[model samples]
Target: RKPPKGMFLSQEDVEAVSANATAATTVLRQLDMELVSVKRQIQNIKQTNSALKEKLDGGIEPYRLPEVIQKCNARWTTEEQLLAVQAIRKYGRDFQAISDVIGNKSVVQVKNFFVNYRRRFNIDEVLQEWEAE
Candidate 1:
């Protein structure tokens, strides 16, 4: 079972809480360092990917969804799709920013489009095409 969310107790409990806080602080500090190390690794990989893109393709371009959305039945122009993909890349899946760029699209719609994009060209055939190239 999950522990109770909170409670208060005596002086001994206060001391115990202080000790646990100190322990957790040390643990979180170590975790932060580990996170920084991972971030550096990610930066290196990003740079390598950037170099590969420059060498191989002129950085793959996005045009449009090229297909009608299923649930929303939303049709997107090539310009809209380009804006969505560009905003998503720049903002990293931030639907709000992507929506603003796409215009007339809500965050929910933008997120749905992005999810579909990920399932298809974003993650599947596009990656394969990039690899083949």
Candidate 2:
């Protein structure tokens, strides 16, 4: 028999090409399978996360504890009032300095005292005297 024409592949070469094609197809199939598995895993993770979020949303309860009666050092003693007046005279409405002089009292308390007891403590007279300077 005549040999095959030129440009025709040998039997071995054909077999090798067929094997390579099969291997390539197998690799592509495996990659597709792996892609599907990854997609499923991602879907599972998303579902789990949403389920956890829902559980948390439903499970959490807002709670209100009894209103705590905060301890108040509201009672201003005569000595403290005297010191506050003296501090106001010296500090001239600088309540921060006045608070320091009054000791353990906040500037807010000092200001409140000044406002609430302006007539009682003659604070307006003190302010007028200070303003005259």
Candidate 3:
């Protein structure tokens, strides 16, 4: 049987509980994601350091060295991605800034690659991926 509006939790507690649940879920999911990002960042840094050492030792440029660096920095630090959103919101980004957007780039990155990029995001995607109870 349903409780009357004036009974038990009242309308306010019901709303509060629901909001708390959603916030908790988001916090948990974001933490999990941030942890994964941290691990990936560590591994990327190790590889980059090794490559740089080899370069300083006069090793030939690895075929994808530049690309690797771009990818690494993009993965570890999201400063560029955040800047993209900021740049758009402000009336900024001169021709040089705007030109970078052309080459499969935006400001967003998917699992890989960098550029002015867009990701189709949904909270449901995270919920479904985690299969949260």
lDDT of 3 at 27: 61
Q: Write the per-residue lDDT of candidate 1 for residues 36-126, one digit (tens) a residue.
A: 9999999999999998878866444563355434333267777777777666556665577767666667778776775677765474443
Better of 2 and 3 by TM-score: 2
* Model 1, C-alpha of 107: deviation from truth (Å): 0.7
Error of 1 at 62 (Å): 34
Of the candidates numbered 2 and 3, which has the greater lDDT value? 2
RMSD (CA, Å), each prediction: 17.5, 19.6, 24.5
Model 2 per-residue lDDT tens digits across residues 1-133? 5567776656865555468658757766888999999999999999999888887774534664455443446779988888888777777988888876666687789889998888899998888777777
TM-score of each: 0.35, 0.44, 0.27
Please list the residue runs of candidate 2 whose C-alpha ends up more than 4 Å from where it truly belongs after superposition.
1-72
Please list the C-alpha lDDT of all candidates, in the order they appear. Answer: 0.66, 0.79, 0.49
User: What is the lDDT ranking, best to worst?
Assistant: 2, 1, 3
lDDT of 3 at 99: 25
Worst 10 residues of 1 by lDDT: 64-73
Estimate, for each residue in 1-133, the C-alpha lDDT of model 3 and write its tens digit. 7878876856854555568658757766888999999999999999999988886774455644443222223332365455444433332324245325332343334323223243432323433444442
Model 3 lowest lDDT segment of ten:
67-76
